[PDB]
Amino acid sequence: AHRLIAKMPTIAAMVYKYSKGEPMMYPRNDLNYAENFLHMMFNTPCETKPISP
């Protein structure tokens, strides 16, 4: 259950980043669940800017 709840966001992000043809992003332990998701979704290794609360 933990594995699923934890990985699903990372995978969902990978799908989006893949469709776009952008490089896939890794998670960050210093961001909460929602923040992390949005980071993995829209941020890049180009510029890692902070997420709107």
Next chain:
Amino acid sequence: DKKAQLIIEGSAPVELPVLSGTMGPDVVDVRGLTATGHFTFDPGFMSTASCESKITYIDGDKGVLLHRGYPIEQLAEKSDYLETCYLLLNGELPTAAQKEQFVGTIKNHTMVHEQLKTFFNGFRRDAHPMAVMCGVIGALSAFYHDSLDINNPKHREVSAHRLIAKMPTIAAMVYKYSKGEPMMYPRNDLNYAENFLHMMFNTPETKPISPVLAKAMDRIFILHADHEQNASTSTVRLAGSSGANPFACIASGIAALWGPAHGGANEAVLRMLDEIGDVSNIDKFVEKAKDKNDPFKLMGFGHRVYKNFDPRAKVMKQTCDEVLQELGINDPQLELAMKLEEIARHDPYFVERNLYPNVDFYSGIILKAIGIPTSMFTVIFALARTVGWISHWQEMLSGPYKIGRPRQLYTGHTQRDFTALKDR
């Protein structure tokens, strides 16, 4: 207004309309010739005007090169590469608003589609950078083609932006690949030149870029932005006239530029310095050059167009001296080069022959000094010229063009029947 009578001696006289321009020479309209049953003969098109243009004007005798009316030396001294890009594309210099928006868009398109990474894996790491470029950006066609309406100016505009933005990223990938180092991504907090140098030399330690080197690079880009009609530029136009995809046309341009005759001066001047080897035997090779009988001649001295002086030369000298001020001329080949320069400038033979150290000599030295290998020199050229090519393509298409079928002079055999295997 004016007319020109052509009397062929065999045929009757024909009226050819002579057209003038904003500046430069007048031109004689020869489109009527095929009607009278003749062609003009022009190996290399050296006396034939392909088109109307209002992008870049050149007058070698006077030492004049100007983009949209602005002299190259002024742009190089004052503006930056992206401002010059805007000028070449849009026809006037930008406002702060126009500039902001343009730079923004260019920064938006800088990242390259991850699929392309696997493309490079189809090359040998020792493969020629220009071959890699020719292939890679030739393949970009496949990625930006389905939407692309060649006749829609919005599509032309976005295609130009895409090219200007991606070319540095790709050029960097070529270098990083040849080295066997991991390929670097762009950074929105760095300017064009800075970004290029970052992608080139930094790794996943990310140390800051020298403003001196960055500025020098930017100037090099400005000074190679466009150079009127030439092998590559005209190849882009000729290919493009069929209604061909822009990226493909640029790939044609790179193929043409790769040719040693078109873009290998930077390499040539370095091979000269290799041939010299040591400072100790500079005089030896100076006399060897001066010897009419000896195939040796100095490279990067004088110019076939800008006979008296190249307006870019001064600015390039400044930049070279400024770069070597920071780096220190550690290399003995660089030391050799600056001595050769000293000699050439303060020597009566070279002075009287108008054999001044040119843009290619200085730029070769700079690029080498700041760490670019000779193999890449032509890729840096291509990088800078891209904006010129696409600007000329944009102009051609924005006007009312025509496919473009060059004629020939037939000197082969007369019509003959098929000689059976027995006769041969």
Next chain:
Amino acid sequence: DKKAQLIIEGSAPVELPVLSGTMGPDVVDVRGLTATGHFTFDPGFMSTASCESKITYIDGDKGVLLHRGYPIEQLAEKSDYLETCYLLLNGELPTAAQKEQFVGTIKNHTMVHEQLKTFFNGFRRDAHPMAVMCGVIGALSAFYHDSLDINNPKHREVSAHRLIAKMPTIAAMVYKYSKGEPMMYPRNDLNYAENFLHMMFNTPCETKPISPVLAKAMDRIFILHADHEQNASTSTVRLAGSSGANPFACIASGIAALWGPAHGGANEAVLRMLDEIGDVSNIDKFVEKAKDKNDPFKLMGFGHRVYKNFDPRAKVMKQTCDEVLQELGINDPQLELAMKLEEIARHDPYFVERNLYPNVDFYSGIILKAIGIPTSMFTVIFALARTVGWISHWQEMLSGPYKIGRPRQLYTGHTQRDFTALKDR
């Protein structure tokens, strides 16, 4: 022998040497113009002769197209593609010995370097075949460059062979890739055309034999597209090559140019016409729709801008089409439609009098479709055939004394003006 006086009105008269050729019109040497401070003006170079050539001669008015003196119809009727390749490259037809050796070499170079397979994986499978070709053979440069001495005729020769041999294999790989099928290798026991069709349609699942009718039809299609004098693509190859550029790169430039709808999209156009018709039932509808001057609809693949009266290739192409459809048996309603449209066009007074005859492009489009090639590939087949022409024209100019082409322009832009700084705008 002859001279031509050019009077500019603004300037004093100038003497231009008028040069003649083995056949065709005379030419007026304008290289002296830049000395007098003028240029010629020629959008599209339609009245400007780029060079001397002895490869292909054309006279549209007379319906004449001949390679090395040999008419296209004779070559198409008698010789094969590789014999025609030898002709275009070497200047005369081969002996049995010369032929044997040439075919042998071509068969030696047919296999492609395994590294290139991974190149295709950098494309989308739905990507345009011509884009893929432009990229792939553009990358070949990297593989055959280090040895390659552009000035050495042996290197030129082997480069030409490599190209003529590999292009089919590559073209096949493009198709097999788009489909998502496994890419096929060549076979030394099959002739050029046979081999191509094998690589195209056969699988490692079942390697069944190739129709001699289809193979022969394909071969003739190749012959009839081998070279066509100076044109967008051919001249692009020459212009690029003039800088001393790698041959493979120059061919890549040619493919880029040919891709242009204007240069090489007639085969596609004629098919789009048949799509627009749709059914046989409404042929008459679209016939009148075409005849309507006011209506943007016009028939595609009928008549020709050069070969106004007749195309010498048309007859042989008709023969080939009828022969192919004899074997396959017009299963497709679009093919049925096409042959009816042909019947009409030929036996109709309007089209007869307008010289709107079914042309090489119409017939070849139908054939290629009938034998299974998708419309996307049509231009790749063109490129395949033309490769030999391009490299022959490249070989010719390089073998001659050449000067880096640097055309001129007519400046109609701003006049010298100072740089206004960013804060003054």
